[PDB]
Design a protein around this nucleic acid. Structure first.
Lengths: 382, 174, 226, 232, 42, 176, 140
RNA sequence: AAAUAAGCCAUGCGUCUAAGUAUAAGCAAUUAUACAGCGAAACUGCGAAUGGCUCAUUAAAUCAGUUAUCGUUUAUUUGAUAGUACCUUACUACAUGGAUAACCGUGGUAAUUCUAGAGCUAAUACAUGCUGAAAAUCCCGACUUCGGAAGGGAUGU
RNA sequence: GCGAUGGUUCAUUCAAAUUUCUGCCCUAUCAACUUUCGACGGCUGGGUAUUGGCCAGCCGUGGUGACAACGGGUAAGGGUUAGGGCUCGGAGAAGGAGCCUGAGAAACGGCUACUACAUCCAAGGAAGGGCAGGCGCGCAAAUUACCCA
């Protein structure tokens, strides 16, 4: 366990030490043949085999909070960790490196992921209910719970009909692809394929709510965020022309305000009715931001920011002041938080999946109680 | 589930067939390695005959051949420019074979001013095609990948020169 | 919680019955490998500080280092871990182990005394225990007895006398057959190896020279035909 | 563990050696072109009785095959391996007969010292050196530069070097070691190319029977010059 | 035409009765349709 | 020696200066003997290039360490690919301005040498040896690599290289 | 699309063409010698090697991207009739653009490594005949 | 020498040679004491692509003849096999490392190596591996007394 | 000096994998079939030990069939030549799903999760998934034999 910042401490309790680690073969050879003096006390892991030896893609904790599903790269697989028993429940291999999954049930008993070789794979604990090829490539994955329907964005322009751009949506009770929700992306070359060209033609992020009204918000590469309403099956809004490709989309706890962000590193907190921004922040460097979620220390509200320049900044919403900043020392591809408090699980490029602990945003979760006492022992050490 | 057999497909006369036999370990095909840009992440796979092939998943540098003059140097890899097969590899920066990718130019520039001595990109045997000279003034050349990164563990290759250089510039303009 | 207390520097160990968990309250919420003072344990433990190195809770489950749960956890154990030995090669087995945290539900606490005090525990600190075997390789004998280049380890090896059967005969000595001892048999083996190398290279030389002269002879006879 | 009838018809077994037959171990000669040492010792020569007796002969250094001590019992010895037994002071040689079976030939040291081996291929090995591969899988480094494919070589067998060679020739007498006309000592009188696979030769015996055998199945033995003693 | 590129609207057999529709919406359906009218245009 | 180099670099990092502070991870991997050739092209041509503000602070430490790695005989193979390509891969990536300090640590006693005076030949210098005949060989191999990697940019360093090469040449020509 | 090339020949030098003979008593056509098309399944341009069986026959469908189908007729012996019957088969072969293609002609093919699910053959010699459509029959 | 079941019911079930590692607190000894003979335990290497069982079937796809691998992998066999030094540590280096098992002890649990703590010790197990020396080793060879060579280039896989 | 052990490459042997032409029994109350897991190419890559629509991107219009495709029926021989004899000849290890070793397995030998039985216990926990034999009416009929010689 380390501590990175001065004023408000974060705690890298599990994580890769070096930006260029050696091959694990050479590491085990030097460990079993050489003499070494490691920090036996403070260095540990908290859940068993929380690594992938190549890279990682996404982490999600269930609404029951007992299961951590995580997908990673070599022999492209997904680990399911039971978090009460602090170990691997299992790990199941797949056909290619996963893009993005969601849990459907409150447990891990139903999963779906959009997967790099243009597939959607539906997973049970029994095995794998069979895959559906989406026609065109995909970027994200969202779930309409009230009318159970998976919706994925697509890059590129459609085959026939209009040339807007498409969001592929299939219901689970009905079973078929209903109709692609048509989102304009822009103009493309008439001379190309049917998968698009290299420069543009991509819808990126789809975001919905699951306790409020739930306006299906999409976001596409010419600086455009769109809004669709369920039970209308048609467009409501087109707004937010920016310079950067929209990579962030997340509602707040109330169900009104939106936190979007662009590929240059600029975030805008919008209201759903005011065209002028409630908040703007131009931070980091020119590497594109990835993921932003709202998180409430039990009284206040604050916001995440995670960007591939190894910058994850927790901003304030009520004042806009930079509350804290973490440097994960590697590329990180996904952030999630334990829904109780405190713990940010981050899927990275490195070997080990790394998780941060904020004592000043919340407490240790209900399955690893002693983390607060370990922070206490580090406070004794300093 | 990923395999290499032909028992699932229809015949030459247009007929399907039952022909149910179990998948065997010589019809084995493993999952693809989308080799991307990053620090070195290679996993070693043992294969039939106990033979190792090196599945490289994240790569930084490889040596590239400026071979009309007689050098090859280890240079880094900036970002993939274009790929003849897919657009998603161009989008998500995947290093495959026959990928045109832009690389750094500093060791080639150093070897030019070290061997000949006339500086470049800032008598008669030192001669540079002016398109390639524009690549040197940019400090970022257009290489092409000739080695399989997935099945060797390295992304090496030769630089583009002349007709192929002009062809891939026109294809970038396309 | 009975304390299996070991002094590793002397090589001795003793199990100590401990009742009255008010005495054992300072062991609580301490991970394995942590330094706790034995001063609040007893008056005979004044000045002692010791590390806790493991334990077994009720129902006899082991305690592996690096598990943050206080209760009994269900790990998946690989080959070279503690608390599990493989029945066959390549086997990963799910075993239940107690987490690192010393709670109230323990049965034995493995402790190791790192620094003593002025008082001696009568059965623990007083008895010396030598090592079971002495060193076998010559350079470890050299680093042990700090020999120079001349002093010829073969008489500086440790020895041990045993009395065999046969109705009480003479004592008999045993000596551990030094591994890294340069004998003339070893040196002659090295010389035979490099002699095989030079014999092979000179045979390649002679066969190459005779092929050169025979090939020149054959092309001379071919051009004599032409 | 093959049966006695599934054993090939050219290393003979009678109604005596049980229903089973030993398989030859992997080695220089092939499987179906082979005589194992146990069949040579106790089923052909009958210097032994049982498997354990054959083992008690083999394990002590009393049987030498091609000039080297061969210890394991089912060692393959297919064609023209000189087999030296020193306690009996004999050297046997394996040839065929006119019907197509194995034949043994007793001889002393003067003809026991050399082996007539047919060249399988010539190549350039590592180090830029030409090397030569016979049918005994003997590779000879730096050969004579005319010894091409299908030429036979007098191997020294005390150093292993080349001593003489016989060229593939229309007019050189040859021995057949395969095919439907197997084991017929006659003279190569014609050779047809058939480029595109499987060329042939036309061959006649001493007493006028023409037949076509393949250039793989042929084996050169000498023009007249019987360099190994075919049994009289 | 080819491998997956056209949306073949076929009712999938094992994909038929996965999840029950769970309406989790904290708003009372009369204020929500009034909201979508009064965006940036109105 | 790799162990003494590691302990010396640990003492240099015990000197706690902000010029060396962002480069410590890049420094120690050069002494880790498995990652030297990859760490060289991480250091130069990387996203974390040496910043010209504190280039004046890191370069003497880095060049003494790279000099030691170019000297060391243990991990290198035989032939050219053993250690000749290592010297070439150091000198090909070094700057021509750092190359002055590189040859400064290269030439110990022959740094301030003078071969020619107002008169013809300094026989007083030439009838004396400051270096062993073992040691001049690695010097000449290194300067051959320096010149073959520099080219014209030797022009600011003419005054000492020719004195070194001429001294070794005429000591050899006296020893025939 | 990528720039087609003969895989190991250094074109961009500032200081040729590789065509091998198939052998087997054949002659390289002038288009295969100098004609600037590039095809890697061509036995004179690419690295495909012809070995094994050598077949002939008459083309059914020339109209296809460098792949022709041959109707091979033969006379099967039915023992129930004690008679000869006509049996037609369809082969596929990859076509080099070196030759001049006709319909109904008698074409020589050669066996190579598997180039597709059907394609195991390459054209080597074309005999220009006035052969007709599907009504025409000759064992060949 | 010929000798339907569905369902009930009990019983039965590796690997050592002169030639890797022996301080067994193991046996057996003496005429020059690290070891020597036999050698359980354990570490190391090999082994189990089958011996044979059950039952919804495979309709030129298997299979047979007949080709090819210039489109591929191969432990074992047997045969050949590897010219690769110097190259700024020298005011140097020159009997190479650390782990563990067996073993000795202290135990926990109802729960057999389910195992925890503490102390050892070997390798043909895992692992590093400039050096005696001013030479080495390849290709050329002028001059030539077969003399055997002045001196020229060069440094694996 | 003789061997044992080990080592790079090329052999050789033992294999394994594909692969070319011909050869199945009947039937038109089976005339259209394939493109309904791409159906035929060619280009580019991925993966494989390698070729290959085997798989992924780009486009072209195919491929088979009254000379019997396709579908349906289930009743699943070759070589050795007097003769008979003799020889050779898919799916599962309680059920799906995923993984591990090795030259060779998708071993079912192990592991993990889910499902379904079932055992010991001090009620906290912990190990495990075959054939053979008898009865199969209340009345019946061939050894639970010995050894690797």
């Amino acid at each position: 366990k380390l501590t990175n910042p001065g004023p408000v401490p974060v705690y890298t309790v599990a994580g890769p030490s070096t930006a260029r680690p050696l091959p694990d073969w050479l590491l085990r050879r030097r460990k079993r043949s050489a003499k070494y003096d490691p920090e036996n006390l403070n260095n540990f892991e908290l859940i068993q085999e929380f690594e992938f030896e190549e890279a990682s893609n996404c982490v999600r904790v269930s609404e029951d909070g007992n299961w951590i599903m995580s997908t990673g790269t070599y022999k492209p697989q997904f680990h399911v960790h039971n978090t009460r028993e602090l170990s691997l429940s299992f790990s199941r291999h797949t056909n290619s490196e996963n893009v993005t999954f969601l849990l459907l049930s409150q447990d891990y008993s139903k999963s779906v992921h959009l997967q790099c070789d243009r597939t959607l794979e539906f997973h049970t604990p029994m095995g794998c209910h069979y895959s559906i090829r989406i026609p065109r490539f995909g970027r994200d994955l969202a779930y309409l719970r009230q009318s159970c329907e998976v919706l994925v964005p697509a890059v590129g322009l459609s085959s026939d009909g209009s040339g807007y751009g498409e969001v592929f949506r299939l219901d689970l009770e009905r079973g078929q692809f209903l109709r692609p929700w048509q989102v304009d992306v822009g103009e493309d070359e008439p001379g190309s394929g049917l998968q698009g060209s290299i420069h543009a033609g991509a819808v990126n992020v789809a975001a919905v709510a699951e306790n409020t009204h739930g306006l299906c918000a999409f976001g596409t590469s010419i600086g455009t965020v769109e809004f669709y309403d369920p039970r209308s099956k048609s467009r409501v809004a087109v707004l937010g022309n920016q310079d950067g490709e929209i990579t962030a989309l997340d509602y707040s706890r109330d169900g009104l305000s939106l936190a979007l962000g662009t590929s240059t590193g600029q975030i805008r907190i919008f209201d759903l009715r005011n065209p002028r921004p409630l908040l703007k922040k131009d931070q980091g460097m020119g590497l594109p931001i990835k993921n932003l979620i709202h998180l409430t220390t039990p009284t206040e509200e604050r916001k995440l920011l995670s960007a591939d320049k190894r910058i994850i900044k927790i901003w304030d919403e009520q004042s806009g002041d930079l509350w804290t900043s973490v440097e994960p020392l590697v590329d990180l591809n996904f952030v999630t938080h334990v829904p109780d408090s405190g713990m940010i699980l981050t899927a990275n490029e490195g070997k080990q999946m790394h998780c941060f602990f904020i004592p000043n945003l919340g407490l240790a979760p209900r399955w690893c109680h002693f983390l607060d006492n370990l922070v206490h022992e580090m406070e004794s050490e300093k | 589930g990923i395999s290499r057999d032909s028992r699932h497909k229809r015949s030459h006369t247009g007929a399907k067939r039952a022909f149910y036999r179990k998948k065997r370990a010589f019809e084995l095909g493993r999952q693809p390695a989308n080799t991307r840009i990053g620090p070195k992440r290679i996993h070693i796979v043992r294969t039939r005959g106990g033979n190792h092939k090196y599945r490289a998943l994240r790569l930084d540098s490889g040596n590239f051949a400026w071979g009309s003059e007689g050098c090859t140097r280890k240079t880094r890899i900036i970002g993939v420019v274009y790929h003849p097969s897919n657009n998603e590899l161009v989008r998500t920066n995947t290093l495959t074979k026959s990928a045109v990718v832009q690389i750094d130019a500093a060791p080639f520039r150093q070897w030019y001013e070290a061997h000949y001595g006339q500086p470049l990109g800032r008598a008669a045997h030192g001669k540079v095609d002016p398109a390639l000279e524009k690549q040197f003034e940019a400090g970022r050349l257009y290489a092409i990948i000739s080695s399989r990164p997935g099945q060797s563990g390295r992304a090496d290759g030769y630089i583009l020169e002349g007709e192929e250089l002009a062809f891939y510039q026109r294809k970038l303009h396309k | 919680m009975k304390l299996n207390i070991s002094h590793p520097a002397n090589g001795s160990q003793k199990l100590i019955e401990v009742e009255d968990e008010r005495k054992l309250r300072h062991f609580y919420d301490k991970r394995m490998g942590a330094e706790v003072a034995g001063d609040p344990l007893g008056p005979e433990w004044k000045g002692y500080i010791l590390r806790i190195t493991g334990g077994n809770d009720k129902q006899g489950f082991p305690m592996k280092q690096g598990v943050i749960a206080p209760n009994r956890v269900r790990l998946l154990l690989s080959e070279g871990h503690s608390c599990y030995r493989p029945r066959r090669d390549g086997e990963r087995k799910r075993k239940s182990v107690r987490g690192c945290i010393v709670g109230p539900d323990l049965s034995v606490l493995a402790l190791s005394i790192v620094k003593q005090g002025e008082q001696d525990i009568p059965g623990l600190t007083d008895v010396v225990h030598p090592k079971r075997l002495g060193p076998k390789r010559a350079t470890k004998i050299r680093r042990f007895f700090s020999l120079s280049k001349d002093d010829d380890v073969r008489k500086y090896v440790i020895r041990r006398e045993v009395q065999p059967k046969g109705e009480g005969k003479k004592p008999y000595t045993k000596a551990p057959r030094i591994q890294r001892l340069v004998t003339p048999q070893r040196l002659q083996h090295k010389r035979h190896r490099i002699a095989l190398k030079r014999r092979q290279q000179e045979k390649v030389k002679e066969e190459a020279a005779e092929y050169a002269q025979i090939l020149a002879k054959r092309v001379a006879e071919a051009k004599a035909q032409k | 563990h093959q049966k006695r009838l599934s054993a090939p018809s050219h290393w003979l077994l009678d109604k005596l050696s049980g229903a089973y037959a030993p398989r030859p171990s992997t080695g220089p000669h092939k499987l179906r072109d082979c005589m194992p040492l146990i069949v040579f010792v106790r089923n052909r020569l009958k210097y032994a009785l049982n498997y354990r007796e054959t083992k008690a002969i083999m394990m002590q250094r009393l049987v030498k095959v091609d000039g080297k001590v061969r210890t394991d019992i089912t060692y393959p010895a297919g064609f023209m391996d000189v087999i030296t037994i020193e306690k009996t002071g004999e050297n046997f040689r394996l040839i065929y007969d006119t019907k197509g079976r194995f034949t043994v030939h007793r001889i002393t040291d003067e003809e026991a010292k050399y082996k007539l081996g047919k060249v399988k291929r010539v190549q350039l090995g590592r180090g830029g050196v030409p090397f030569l591969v016979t049918h005994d899988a003997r590779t000879i480094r730096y050969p004579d530069p005319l010894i091409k494919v299908n030429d036979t070589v007098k191997i020294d067998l005390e150093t292993g070097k080349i001593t003489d060679f016989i060229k593939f020739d229309t007019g050189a007498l040859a021995m057949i070691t395969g095919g439907r006309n197997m084991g017929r000592v006659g003279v190569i009188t014609h050779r047809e190319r058939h480029d595109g696979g499987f060329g042939i030769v036309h061959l006649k015996d001493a007493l006028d029977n023409t037949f076509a055998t393949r250039e793989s199945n042929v084996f050169v033995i000498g023009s007249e010059k019987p360099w190994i003693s075919l049994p009289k | 035409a080819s491998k997956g590129r056209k949306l073949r609207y076929t009712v999938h057999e094992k994909l038929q009765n996965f999840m029950a529709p769970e309406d989790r919406r904290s708003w009372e359906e009369h204020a929500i349709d009034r909201l979508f009218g009064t965006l940036f245009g109105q | 020696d790799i162990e003494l180099q590691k302990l010396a670099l640990k003492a240099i990092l015990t000197w706690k200066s902000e010029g060396i502070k962002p480069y410590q991870e890049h420094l120690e991997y050069l002494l880790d003997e498995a990652r030297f050739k990859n760490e060289l092209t991480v250091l130069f041509q990387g996203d974390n290039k040496i910043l010209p503000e504190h280039r004046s602070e890191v370069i003497p430490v880095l060049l003494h360490l790279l000099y030691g790695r170019a000297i060391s005989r243990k991990g290198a193979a035989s032939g050219r690919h053993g250690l000749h390509a290592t010297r070439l891969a150091i000198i090909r990536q070094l700057d021509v301005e750092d190359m002055g300090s590189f040859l400064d640590i290269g030439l110990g006693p022959l740094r301030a040498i003078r071969v020619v005076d107002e008169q013809g030949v300094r026989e007083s210098v030439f009838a004396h040896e400051p270096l062993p005949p073992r040691k001049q060989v690695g010097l000449l191999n290194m300067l051959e690599a320096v010149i073959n990697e520099l080219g014209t940019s030797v022009e600011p360093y003419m005054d000492a290289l020719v004195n070194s090469v001429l001294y070794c040449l005429v000591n050899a020509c006296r020893k025939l | 699309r990528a720039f087609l090339k003969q895989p190991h020949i250094f074109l961009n030098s500032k200081v040729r063409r590789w065509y091998k003979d198939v052998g087997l008593g054949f002659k390289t056509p002038k288009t295969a010698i100098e004609g600037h098309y590039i095809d890697k399944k061509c036995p004179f341009t690419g690295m495909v090697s012809i070995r094994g069986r050598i077949l002939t026959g008459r083309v059914v469908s020339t109209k296809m991207h460098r792949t022709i189908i041959i109707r091979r007729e033969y006379l099967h012996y039915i023992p129930k009739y004690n008679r000869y019957e006509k049996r037609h088969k369809n082969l596929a072969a990859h076509v080099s653009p070196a030759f001049r293609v006709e319909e109904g002609d008698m074409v020589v093919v050669g066996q190579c490594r598997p180039l597709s699910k059907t394609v195991r053959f390459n054209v080597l010699r074309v005999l220009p005949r006035t052969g007709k459509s599907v009504k025409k029959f000759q064992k060949f």
